[PDB]
């Protein structure tokens, strides 16, 4: 029974970890896109005149 309980805990924690990893990946992709846009703007109209 101890192994059954441990397996239940393991699968629950694995599901939680997978959800957290997926959310982190989504947020990282969004932040990367936003920072790429910011870098484009900085290279466009901070060095010269737009």
């Amino acid at each position: 029974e101890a192994e059954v309980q441990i397996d239940r805990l393991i699968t629950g924690r694995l599901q939680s970890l997978q959800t957290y990893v997926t959310q982190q990946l989504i947020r990282a992709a969004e932040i990367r896109a936003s920072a790429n846009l910011a870098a484009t703007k900085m290279s466009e109209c901070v060095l010269g005149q737009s």
């Binding site: 290279s43 466009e44 060095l47 010269g48 737009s50």
Partner: protein
């Protein structure tokens, strides 16, 4: 027209090339070098009037005054054909007699 979009510095043109899973661009760029030094002035006063360059900037090596472009040095004799008059130079800062 936008600076540093494709290529470094002023852009001229580009050539595309294929790749197994992508594309390869070759940008041809224009870059200046061999700088110099000069003494400049913003405006020219003559007969109580102010003269401004139509396009370019005023330069002088010490004894004569010439007008050149922004990115190259081909001095030309200043005339009335490449300048225009606007009011009198009394409030302009940096005027020089000529």
């Amino acid at each position: 027209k936008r600076v540093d979009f494709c290529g470094k510095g002023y852009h001229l043109m580009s050539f595309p090339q294929s790749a197994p899973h992508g594309v390869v661009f070759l940008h041809v760029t224009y870059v200046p070098a061999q700088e110099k030094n000069f003494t400049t002035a913003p405006a020219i006063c003559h007969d109580g009037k102010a003269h401004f360059p139509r396009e370019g900037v005023f330069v002088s090596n010490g004894t004569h005054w010439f007008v050149t472009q922004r990115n190259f040095y081909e001095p030309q004799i200043i005339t009335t054909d490449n300048t225009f008059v606007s009011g009198n130079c009394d409030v302009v800062i940096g005027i020089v007699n000529n």
